[PDB]
């Protein structure tokens, strides 16, 4: 089905403790494949997936240089943003950037992305048209004016429509063994008596990929959307993910509850029940 590639970046100033830290990672869908950390002994972009290891010296050098140039630019922007926001240089601030593309089953571009955030808040984002911008405030508007005059949107659009999707397909072909394989969740239901009057029914989903998944509990066929405890999908550490949903049920009414599981790795949605 559909696939995506994303490059995440984070720059964090630490006044009195050296230059801003820089960390960038790249993903194809939910698979991490490259990383760069300015605090590493000898900073360089490193592979984090077996299918990217084959790329030659030129690739790695270019990538490393890009990362370094980005880190430098973020440092200049953190200083600029202090002015834009009339802030002292004594505090720590954050600059985040994400960009990438989504392509459909046929390998064509579905959508492009390029958005920044300052101290956790939306700053400036390229619109889905890949030609206009959205500034979250008057400070961001200053950046918008500089980028419009310099025609940044055109450059980004050319990358997003060309290189981005071109390399994504290349990665997908090279790592097809993993990037194009869905691991369905292994599921089961646990029951934990809380007291004589009620008990916990927990629906588990383990070792699945990609992360996208839906878990829901129904009482007499009705979604318990407001009475379900759902934990954040979490990484198992081996590329797969885990997640669970729980409901506090009245003792004796356990069989009125069904857990429903949806995941691209399953031919049909699953429905589970607790076996007393």
């Amino acid at each position: 089905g559909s696939h995506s590639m994303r490059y995440f970046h984070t720059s964090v100033s630490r006044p009195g403790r050296g230059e801003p830290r820089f960390i960038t990672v790249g993903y194809v869908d939910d698979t991490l494949f490259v990383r760069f950390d300015s605090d590493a002994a000898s900073p360089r972009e490193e592979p984090r997936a077996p299918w990217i290891e084959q790329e030659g010296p030129e690739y790695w050098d270019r990538e490393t240089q890009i990362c370094k140039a980005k880190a430098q630019t973020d440092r200049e922007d953190l200083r600029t943003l202090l002015r834009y926001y009339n802030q002292s240089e004594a505090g720590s601030h954050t600059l985040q950037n994400m960009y990438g593309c989504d392509v459909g089953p046929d390998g064509r571009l579905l959508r492009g992305y390029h958005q920044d955030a300052y101290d956790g808040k939306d700053y400036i984002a390229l619109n889905e048209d890949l030609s206009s911008w959205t500034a979250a405030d008057t400070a961001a508007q200053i950046t918008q004016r500089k980028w419009e005059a310099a025609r940044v949107a055109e450059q980004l659009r050319a990358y997003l429509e060309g290189e981005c999707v071109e390399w994504l397909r290349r990665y997908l072909e090279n790592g097809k063994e993993t990037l194009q394989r869905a691991d369905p969740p292994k599921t089961h239901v646990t029951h934990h008596p809380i007291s004589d009057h009620e008990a916990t029914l927990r629906c588990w989903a383990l070792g699945f990929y990609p992360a996208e998944i839906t878990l829901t509990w129904q009482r007499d066929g009705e979604d318990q959307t407001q009475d379900t405890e759902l934990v954040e999908t979490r990484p198992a550490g081996d590329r797969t993910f885990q997640k669970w949903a729980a409901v506090v049920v009245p003792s004796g009414e356990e069989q009125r509850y069904t857990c429903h599981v949806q995941h691209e790795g399953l031919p049909k949605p699953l429905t589970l029940r607790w076996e007393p």
């Binding site: 270019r62 630019t73 922007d77 943003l81 950046t143 310099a150």
Partner: peptide, 9 residues
């Protein structure tokens, strides 16, 4: 593969 172009805010 990453985007190059260096442009400050």
């Amino acid at each position: 593969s990453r985007y190059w172009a260096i442009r400050t805010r």
